[PDB]
Design a protein around this nucleic acid. Structure first.
Lengths: 534, 445, 84, 74, 97, 71
RNA sequence: GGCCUCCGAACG
RNA sequence: ACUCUGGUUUCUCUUCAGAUCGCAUAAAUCUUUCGCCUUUUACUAAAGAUUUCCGUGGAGAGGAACAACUCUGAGUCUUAACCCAAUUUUUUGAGCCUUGCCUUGGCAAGGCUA
């Protein structure tokens, strides 16, 4: 046996109903999806480990091992990234009080793996970036910013390991606000420096960036800090608070008097005092001040722990303290829905720049497909291996229609066209699969507007192939494939040692090429099989 | 319940009448045949009794046979903490200071046998007077004083707030200054820096990868041909796979094929490899105990704003009227800079496994209180040939024990050595390494 | 600081809901926004008067104190708010 | 608390204001307070007989408003 | 025509000079070198030929003693030193040119 | 003091009486200080109609009584 | 640019 | 702010631990490959499956030692200075008339108010 990884066969989560969450994501428009990458190997999975850790009741303790589910890719993910990106979805509440359905797919940091991460990013209508506070923006952030700018997809700046980079380097608050302000100046400078409109408006007050730390797993933002500080005292200030939260201002003795210009002797900036002051002091309350100041700061912050829990160790008490203070997810969903567009509003330009034929009967078929239902048109994403290596499930985007179990669908190929489709063939959907953390939910019929996995399409599915209704629906089926934004360089020709292994090498090359659409398997004129990758 | 008998009565009486033989031990003959018939009692007892040079003390309770045949000493290793590892390593630092001094060395050696007639009863004089030797560590700037009181002990903390609070060993606990002075005295001995990629691509999964691919490294252990027998090749297969005229750039770097299992296609069977890069983090080194909390590393911010951009809504009315500070605007009043060794604790945030563990649980001081192997991993050229190959031999034993793994299967029961006291067998008592060890020597004779 | 039914009212934002004021007019449609005082801003409303006549109105916003009750979809009855 | 209702989407928009007792007025919203008092420009009262009269800019108390309705797309 | 792989590298000054010596050993003509701020972390992007870029990361991290974390990608193209079809080009199979 | 008076009646079937004479019956899952009623599978009496999940405001409520055990 | 298998005791 | 609930270390016995590593973890047996070899024990160094030592972990039960130290979930957990309510409840405005239905009682609808 010894299957590589188990993506299914897990228990349910806490405060999550399959009825309410499934029909809620497949019914209203509050559902959305995105993928957060940014810099390569900047602790992207750690975010999904924090969200899934706050969702499911059983989560791996950070002290024992990584919070991610065990037996995932084995040394592939254990060494770094590995998975060319896998989809996941969960229901995350928001700071406004209303929950939401968010599908987040972690992305690898490797070059070609980032190209496949963009190929998978062509499905969702939005993307977030993971930028470590230490290294700032990496090459994967620049290339991902160029590919995301060319894709016209909304991106959300997300800072990772903020308290880890500032705590390990012992950065002062002035160099923390100035350094982070320089990183945001480079993010907005590259976004506005890319092309088209400057309306992105990347900034902490605009809610485009979220300051988080993977060491203590503390996710915060402007509205999150204003909601926590206002929740403690002065809850009447919410919008006017976060708007005046940082900016350039000082806190003047008049009670609140915020100085826009001049030092006014108060502080170098308002975000340093009112933001970095309770932040860095919370991290400083541990370590040397951990045992000493625990009753004073813990009693002042209202947090409490058991005698054995508080005496556990430095880092477990730090992640547990951040869980007892900033552990509530606020800026992620609040800053998400405020950034990520709705399904229709983000779908219309996406369907305009995605499918070939637009306008009537095609974009109109997709426009009418958005809210109520589609006329059975499935524009996928990709296909990954199942729990067994025999078959492979197709994890893809559904543009229109409610996929029914066993219902036929017309799936075209790459070179196939709407006028004449040679590769178009009907197929039945065995079972629907929704990927949530380490498990998956099988459904018979999944309505339109959700990216899910299905079975029954293996051989006719090659790379990215959209499915259409068996009725012969016209007007631009088989949506255009995603561009990897890279050129094939490395060519590795593999030949079987035994001559009888030729069919195993051909079939293994077909299934391997379908498992990694980024690579290109081309048979040489001399008869050898050569591979091409970035 | 088993109670401790008088040591001089059972010890002196048993061992006194035991070796006399004649008609007193005539019935004890077979009992002595059982004593000599049991090897592991004296081996595990003597090896289990290790007062160590780091302290000066006596040994522990032991069960001496009611017939005077032999005894056994059951003592758990009871490894204390990295402060204890810093007590042994501190004895190594002070031992190095004594090595630099004393221009005229000592003799030592001298196995005082001279054939054999030391049937020494002088243990009574060992009870009379005491050497009061070893120890000799006075170093502390009013810091390690609690660890100085815990420097030499069989049970470092008898009873306290943070402690094991057991008979011998239990879950460890300590305070912040114990970690401070622990990293101080431990920092005086051999200490490891941050891991990052320096600790990788060398041993553990890397060594298992080198042994799997059966290829040498820039120095290190060596294993075997493994699955490969002698030679397997073909004239048509070599001409198809390779080429007489091909591209030549680099001379096939072995390190490139090591970390890349796709680069070397020869015998990719049962290989644990492909650990990609590292986190590539940066740990700020310590400095003199001065202020401020920021070490002022090179930064040079890009001219701060320099006419870049600003926020929105710069209206003073909505600003001063946007908040009502009815409570304290900051979290709490404090000085989170130098307060309570915030620099020493901040440096303690990144610490090795023994130091970063804070309060410990248990460890074996008779098995692995040695960090020297990892310190010897990837040794520079500062050592001679024989020392380099010897380091490759130490890494060869560590790589053998590492690659051996373990089948942690089930076991029957423990305590069976101590469970032999259920019926009448022996009687324990508090004894010393000279008294109990000398009794084991008489049990050998 | 916010009641559980009010939090459910926040969770129900974005679904087709039915509202009846203190004067008896029935308003059914999607709920755009909901406040702590039960101010409801809605879209695509089909009005039912006390006489039975109906009409179509694009945008309405109702005072919180003037609402007799609200009708929410059954999708919210399972969780998160179920507690013993 | 003291959260003012958000009319910022209805600002400078023609409104249809239903009042208790069969009273109906229409006009443009010039602002609001936390007490739901409305400043309505060009307010026209709808009589029960169907006749219209322009009463000008007026203040409308939030107590008596059953529902406020917008006649434009916001 | 072949692409030119650019590799951004993170390392101290000594490992940056050693990285320049490695690129010189591979005859790579780099991109730029800068003392990356926010922490004294030297970051140097490198323009390099794709043919000589094999094993650049392995030998880079190996020569840096567990440092100099870098990443490469295809950038632009190289026009090659000269035109093919030369009668005197053939010298020896093992000897590089 | 105990405050369980409203906490006892959770999940029970409750017959509600309004100020205008209407009668609401539904599974009572929640309340608040404002007397906001949460009625699952609620019905209206005056004539019976199917309501479903209904959130009733506390200003129009008069009295309540236990209809029966939870379904 | 480095890699250093070695390693004996009885009986007979 | 009242009351019922009522705790810590050590020593044994019985189960479970193909475990996220029982952190720096030893030895033996057999099927073979190999090393040198004049036969054996020992022995050179790799694979596999069969195991033991030093340990060690979880649960339950039985003991002593300061135990009278304190925790515990809940139980109706009965308080006066001063200024205030125009969207949720103790400073907040309802009634009358007429018609139809119901055995009446009563219910539904419309109108009237100032």
């Amino acid at each position: 046996t010894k299957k590589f990884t188990l993506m299914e066969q897990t228990l349910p989560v806490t405060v999550y109903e399959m009825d309410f969450l499934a029909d809620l994501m497949d019914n209203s428009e509050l559902i959305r999806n995105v993928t957060l990458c940014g810099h390569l190997h900047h602790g992207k999975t750690c975010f999904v480990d924090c969200l899934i850790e706050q969702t499911h009741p059983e989560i791996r303790k950070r002290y024992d091992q990584d919070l991610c589910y065990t037996d995932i890719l084995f040394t592939e993910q254990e060494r770094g990234v590995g998975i060319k990106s896998t989809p996941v979805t969960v229901v995350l509440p928001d700071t406004k009080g209303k929950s939401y359905l968010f599908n987040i797919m972690d992305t690898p940091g490797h070059v070609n793996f980032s190209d496949e991460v963009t190929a998978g990013l062509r499905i969702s209508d939005g993307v977030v970036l993971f930028i470590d506070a230490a290294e700032g923006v990496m090459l994967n952030t620049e290339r991902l910013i160029k590919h995301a700018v060319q894709e016209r997809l909304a991106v959300t700046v997300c800072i990772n390991k903020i308290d880890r980079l500032i705590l390990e380097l012992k950065l002062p608050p002035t160099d923390a606000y100035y350094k982070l302000r320089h990183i945001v100046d480079e993010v907005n400078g590259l976004i506005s420096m890319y092309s088209t409109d400057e309306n992105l408006i990347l900034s902490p007050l605009l809610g485009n960036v979220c300051f988080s730390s993977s060491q203590y797993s503390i996710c915060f933002t402007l509205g999150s800090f204003a909601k926590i500080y206002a929740d403690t005292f002065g809850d009447i200030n919410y919008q006017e608070f976060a708007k005046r939260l940082w900016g350039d201002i000082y806190f003047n003795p008049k009670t609140r008097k915020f100085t826009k210009k001049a030092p006014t002797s108060s502080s170098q900036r308002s975000f340093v005092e009112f933001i970095l002051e309770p932040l860095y002091k919370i991290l400083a309350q541990v370590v040397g001040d951990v045992d000493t100041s625990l009753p004073r700061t813990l009693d002042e912050l209202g947090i409490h722990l058991t005698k054995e829990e508080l005496k556990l160790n430095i880092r477990p008490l730090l992640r547990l303290v951040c869980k007892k203070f900033f552990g509530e997810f606020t800026g992620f969903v609040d800053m998400c829905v405020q950034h990520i567009p709705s399904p229709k509003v983000g779908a219309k330009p996406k369907i305009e720049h995605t499918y070939t034929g637009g306008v009537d009967s095609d974009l109109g078929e997709a426009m009418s497909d958005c809210d109520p239902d589609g006329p059975l048109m499935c524009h996928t994403t990709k296909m990954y291996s199942t729990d067994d290596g025999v078959q492979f499930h197709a994890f893809g985007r559904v543009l229109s229609g409610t996929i029914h179990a066993g219902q036929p669908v017309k799936v075209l190929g790459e070179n196939y066209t709407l006028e004449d489709e040679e590769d178009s063939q009907i197929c039945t959907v065995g079972r629907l699969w929704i990927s949530v953390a380490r498990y998956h939910i099988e459904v018979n019929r999944v309505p339109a507007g959700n990216w899910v996995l299905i079975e029954g399409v293996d051989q006719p599915i090659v790379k990215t192939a959209t499915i259409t209704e068996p009725r012969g629906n016209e007007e631009a089926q088989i949506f255009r494939p995603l561009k990897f934004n890279t050129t094939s360089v490395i060519k590795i020709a593999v030949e079987p040692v035994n001559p009888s292994e030729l069919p195993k090498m051909l079939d293994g090359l077909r299934k391997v090429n379908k498992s990694y659409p980024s690579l290109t398997t081309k048979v040489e004129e001399s008869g050898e099989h050569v591979i091409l990758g970035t | 319940q088993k109670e401790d008998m008088p040591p001089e009565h059972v010890r002196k009486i048993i061992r006194d009448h035991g070796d006399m033989t004649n008609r007193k031990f005539r019935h004890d003959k077979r009992v002595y045949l059982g004593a000599l018939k049991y090897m592991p009692h004296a081996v595990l007892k003597l090896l289990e009794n290790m007062p160590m040079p780091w302290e000066q003390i006596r040994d522990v309770p032991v069960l001496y046979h009611i017939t005077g045949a032999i005894s056994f000493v059951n003592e758990i290793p009871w490894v204390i903490e990295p402060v204890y590892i810093s007590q042994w390593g501190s004895m190594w630092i002070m031992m190095r200071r004594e090595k630099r001094d004393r221009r005229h060395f000592k003799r030592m050696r001298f196995p005082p046998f001279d054939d054999e007639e030391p049937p020494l009863d002088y243990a009574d004089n060992i009870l009379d007077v005491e050497p009061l030797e070893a120890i000799q560590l006075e170093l502390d700037p009013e810091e390690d004083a609690p660890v100085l009181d815990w420097f030499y002990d069989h049970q470092p903390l008898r009873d306290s707030r943070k402690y094991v609070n057991g008979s011998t060993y239990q879950r460890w606990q300590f305070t912040l200054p114990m970690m401070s002075t622990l990293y101080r005295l431990a920092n005086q001995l051999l200490t490891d820096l941050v891991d990052d990629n320096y600790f990788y691509l060398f041993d553990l999964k890397a060594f298992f990868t080198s042994k799997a691919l059966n290829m040498a490294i820039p120095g290190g252990p060596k294993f075997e041909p493994l699955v490969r027998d002698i030679n397997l090749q073909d004239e048509d297969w070599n001409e198809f796979n390779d080429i007489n005229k091909i591209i030549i750039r680099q001379p096939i770097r072995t390190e490139y094929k090591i970390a890349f299992p796709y680069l070397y296609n020869n015998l990719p069977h049962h290989v644990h490899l492909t650990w990609y890069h590292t986190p590539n983090v940066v740990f700020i080194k310590t400095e003199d105990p001065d202020l401020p909390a920021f070490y002022f590393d090179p930064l040079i911010n890009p001219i701060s704003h320099r006419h870049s951009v600003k926020s929105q809504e710069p209206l003073p009315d909505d600003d001063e009227e946007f908040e009502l500070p009815e409570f304290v605007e900051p979290f709490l009043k404090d000085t989170p800079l130098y307060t309570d060794n915030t620099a020493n604790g901040i440096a303690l945030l990144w610490a090795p496994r023994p130091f970063n563990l804070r309060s410990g649980r248990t460890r074996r001081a008779l098995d692995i209180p040695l960090v020297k192997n990892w310190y010897r991993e990837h040794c520079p050229a500062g050592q001679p040939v024989k020392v380099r190959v010897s380091y490759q031999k130490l890494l060869k034993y560590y790589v053998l024990n590492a690659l051996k793994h373990r089948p942690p299967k089930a076991q029957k029961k423990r305590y069976l050595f101590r469970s032999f006291k259920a019926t009448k067998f022996f009687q324990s008592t508090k004894l010393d390494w000279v008294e109990v060890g000398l009794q084991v020597c008489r049990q050998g004779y | 600081s916010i009641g559980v039914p009010i939090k459910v009212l926040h969770e129900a934002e974005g679904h087709i809901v039915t509202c009846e004021t203190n004067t008896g007019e029935v308003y059914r449609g999607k709920l755009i926004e909901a406040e702590d005082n039960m101010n409801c801003q809605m879209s695509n409303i089909t009005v039912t008067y006390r006489d039975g006549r109906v009409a179509q109105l694009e945008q309405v916003y109702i005072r919180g104190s003037k609402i007799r009750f609200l009708i929410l979809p059954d999708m919210l009855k399972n969780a998160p708010m179920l507690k013993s | 608390k003291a959260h003012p209702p958000e009319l910022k989407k209805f600002m400078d928009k023609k409104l249809s204001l239903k009042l208790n007792g069969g009273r109906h007025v229409q006009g443009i919203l010039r602002g609001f307070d936390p007490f739901m008092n409305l400043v309505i420009d060009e307010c026209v009262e709808m009589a029960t007989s169907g006749q219209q009269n322009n009463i000008g800019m007026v203040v409308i108390r939030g107590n008596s408003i059953i529902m406020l309705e917008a006649l434009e797309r916001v | 025509m072949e692409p030119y792989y650019f590799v951004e590298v993170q390392a101290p000054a000594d490992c940056v000079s050693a990285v320049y010596t490695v690129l010189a050993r591979r005859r790579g003509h780099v991109t730029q070198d800068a003392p990356i701020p926010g922490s004294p972390l030297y970051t140097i992007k490198a323009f390099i030929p794709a043919i000589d870029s094999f094993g650049f990361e392995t030998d880079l991290r190996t020569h840096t003693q567990g440092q100099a974390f870098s990443l490469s990608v295809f950038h632009h193209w190289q026009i090659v030193p000269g035109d093919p079809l030369d009668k005197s080009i053939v010298i020896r199979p093992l000897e590089p040119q | 003091g105990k405050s369980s008076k409203m906490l006892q009646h959770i999940d029970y079937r409750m017959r509600c009486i309004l100020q205008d004479g209407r009668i609401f019956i539904g599974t009572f899952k929640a309340f608040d200080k404002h007397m906001n009623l949460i009625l699952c599978d609620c019905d209206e009496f005056r004539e019976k109609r199917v309501l479903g999940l209904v959130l009733l405001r506390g200003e129009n409520l008069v009295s309540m009584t236990v209809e029966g055990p939870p379904p």
